[PDB]
Amino acid sequence: EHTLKAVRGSFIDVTRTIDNPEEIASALRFIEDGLLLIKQGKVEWFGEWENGKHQIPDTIRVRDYRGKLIVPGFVDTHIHYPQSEMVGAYGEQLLEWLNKHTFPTERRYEDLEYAREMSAFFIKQLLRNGTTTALVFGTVHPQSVDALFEAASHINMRMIAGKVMMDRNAPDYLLDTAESSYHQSKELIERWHKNGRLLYAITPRFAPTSSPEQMAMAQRLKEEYPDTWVHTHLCENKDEIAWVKSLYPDHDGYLDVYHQYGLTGKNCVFAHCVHLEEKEWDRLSETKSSIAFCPTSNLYLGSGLFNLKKAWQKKVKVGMGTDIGAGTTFNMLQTLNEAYKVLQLQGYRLSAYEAFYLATLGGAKSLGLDDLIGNFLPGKEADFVVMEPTATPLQQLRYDNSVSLVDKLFVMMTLGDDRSIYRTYVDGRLVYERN
Amino acid sequence: EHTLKAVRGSFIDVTRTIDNPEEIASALRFIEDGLLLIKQGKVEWFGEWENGKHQIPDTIRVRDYRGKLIVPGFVDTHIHYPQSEMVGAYGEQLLEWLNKHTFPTERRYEDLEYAREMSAFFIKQLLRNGTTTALVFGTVHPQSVDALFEAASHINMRMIAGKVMMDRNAPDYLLDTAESSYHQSKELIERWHKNGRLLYAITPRFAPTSSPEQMAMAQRLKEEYPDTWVHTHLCENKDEIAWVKSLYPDHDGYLDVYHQYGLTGKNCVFAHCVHLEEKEWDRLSETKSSIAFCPTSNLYLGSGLFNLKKAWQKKVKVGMGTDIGAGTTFNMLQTLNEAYKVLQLQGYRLSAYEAFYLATLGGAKSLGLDDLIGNFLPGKEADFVVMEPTATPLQQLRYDNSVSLVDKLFVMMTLGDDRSIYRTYVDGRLVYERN
Ligand SMILES: [Zn+2]
Ligand SMILES: [Zn+2]
Q1: What does the entry list as the binding residues for substrate (chains A, B)?
Q2: Are A344 and B301 inside 8 Å of each other by CB?
């Protein structure tokens, strides 16, 4: 409420949002001997230790993380809460993956005791990997979303989540109705939206599993609550696209289904977007919609390769998602490593600065939270990660041989996993410690 | 005379080599309550605990690894010893990667104290990841191959290694001559080939960096020592293939340069093989040559996707390699994870049985050592790894949630790292235990 916290160490952040990756080098900030002052869970002062140490009264001990690297909390823009335990070994693609693996897994989260246990486990996985803000697919059952929101509220986490809307083309145990989906999402909105740092997303799974009536209910919810988020899947798989064209033949493609139902615009986030024509690229760019780039699940399911270069050209906001469930890791560093491989296959060179930006401030911007999180600017919420770049013998050996900042970022990205995460602070408090 | 060791736990191995990945299930033996008796570094007896417990003498206590999974030691068919510390810039490709990072890194190994230190480090990395047999690229300098062989012989490891032969198209500090290369490789063969379990490989880096004179010297070495190995790189990158076509215009492509110099045949291993014509597939298959599949470096360098399906159709032996240096991990589980993604991109489903097979007995077969290692058949050399498939909370959850054995192998493949390696035995001796 009024007590100060002081953290010294080496910091990396990006001081402003940009519009081309070539700009990132001029917005990146690295302070080897830096100092972060925290009050009321927000950044109070940040800069060089020699310019700010006078502000620390003799009554306070500084959290001394010298030798570590302190970065803003990672931002995961697409992840499924009720899918941590999922294993899909039989090399299925998207639709068979949904019927064989996704739905039976999410069925176990109808139990509220199981949902309660797994919500704590899910949040701990996030913190364990340095993710402090995520845009989260929930369940179809509203009480499991209640459990997830309660677990996140325990630590005053900034999280966007919502109930999945799906009333057709899925097993009976995982279906709602248009009317029930409207009313349950409305109850969750009134209970959790802008409850502390929590935020609600109107979350239809995708167009195949929602009737026109349910799509209208999602449109109605967005009109009644214009400051909520929208979150859905878009053009992940070609068979999915053909299925959509078969189910909505009178619309001008896949994205046009969401557009006609008023589900495009700012803070509307579309996961995957692997197979877009120009109609849809330009629509996303004019409506200022966001994309959740999920390279790992794209690879595992053989969906394809996301065109990050065309996203930069079209001025579309892109953030990174793990798509846990189909993806296998909660870790943002490994996600960026897989993105690097995906882009190398397209001849696109992903710089370390660009990867770091997409992991932090770029993801926050894609979620419309860049005024709240993403760097160490005074006034930002104090979500950050203390990383140990020497946490593994090979990682330490390659870090001991890196002198430049790009070398350090590249080593962190290519060799990093959960062991690289030494401590995680959320709302200015230590909420995870690797020990 | 000699004494026994008893190892109890859960075991899995493949009991014979196959030629179609569909037969692997028929040859996969899983013993849930099993006993492995070791004498003189070899499998004395293997089978069900109740069928063999009577053979355990009163003088020895059994090593009880119940709750773990015991597998044959992993076989790494292409790895570069003097490259563990290499940190590369982002986005650069094979030939520029070679000239900017690979050669200056390998230059530091002229110092023999540094070579000794890194030889110990390299062996430690192999052991802690469960690799008990590797086909290893050495240096151009004979002293570093001496250091590597000394480290491997200290623990009586079975390792194939050799001095790099390269006399052109590289900085002067990393070049030999045809005559010096022949004589240095002959001295290393005379000192180390069949010294204990050690084996020598005639190792020209690739055709671009070897003159016709040096290629003739390598041919001569292979003719004088027909039981040595041959190990080189082949059709990794399209620019590399075009370079080879310039430097040997009178040969019918890349593989034919090696073939005309009599360097194809049994125990000849060609790394990468990403861009093969159908001529070259048939030539590899008729000469019974082997391929080292390295998915991680293929993806980092934008090389392409190895066609494992055509390798099975053409009946060419394939093993897995890390290309440590360009690759970022010593770990075979992660290597198979990357292979799974590469094959998903090609529409090929890599089975858990197939991945496990290529990691153990299939790899030994590609190296021509399947009569000595690769499973728990009586008489085989006792190189094995005790694995902890539940080594992290997420691994434990996904392993519990798996019902079939292929699901458990898949969990290990997608989530496993060095933390999965609990114990490593080489030559019937415990040589690594996780701290
Ligand atoms: Zn998803
Ligand atoms: Zn190599």
Answers
A1: 80-83, 205-206, 233-236, 323
A2: yes
Taking the C-alpha atoms of residue A244 and residue A240, their distance in angstroms, rounded to an integer, is 6
For residue A247, what are its two tokens?
């189910």
A299 and B397 within 8 Å at the Cβ level: the answer is no
Give chain A's end-to-end CA distance (angstroms, integer): 28
At A422, is the secondary structure helix, strand, or coil?
Answer: strand
Nearest by CB to A344, from B87, B302, B341: name it: B302
Residue ranges per domain, chain A?
Answer: 1-72+375-435, 73-374
Q: Given an 8 Å threshold on Cβ–Cβ distance, is B394 in contact with A299? A: no
Looking at chain A, the number of H-run helices and the number of E-run strands are 18, 16
Which residues lie below 8 Å from residue B5, measured CB to CB, with a gap of 6+? Answer: B37, B38, B39, B60, B63, B428
How many angstroms from the chain centroid is the CA of residue B4? 29
What technique was this entry resolved by? Answer: X-ray
Chain Cα centroid distance, residue B340:
17
Chain B stretch 371-400, residues whose beta carbon is closer than 8 A to a beta carbon of chain A = 392-394, 397-398, 400
A79 touches chain B (CB under 8 A): no
Choose among B375, B334, B342: nearest CA to B357: B375
- ∠A261-A264-A268 over CA atoms, to 5°? 125
CATH number of A73-374: 3.20.20.140
| DSSP secondary structure string for all residues of A165-213 | E--SSS-GGG---HHHHHHHHHHHHHHHTTSTTEEEEEEE--GGGS-HH
- Count of A-B CB contacts under 8 Å: 100
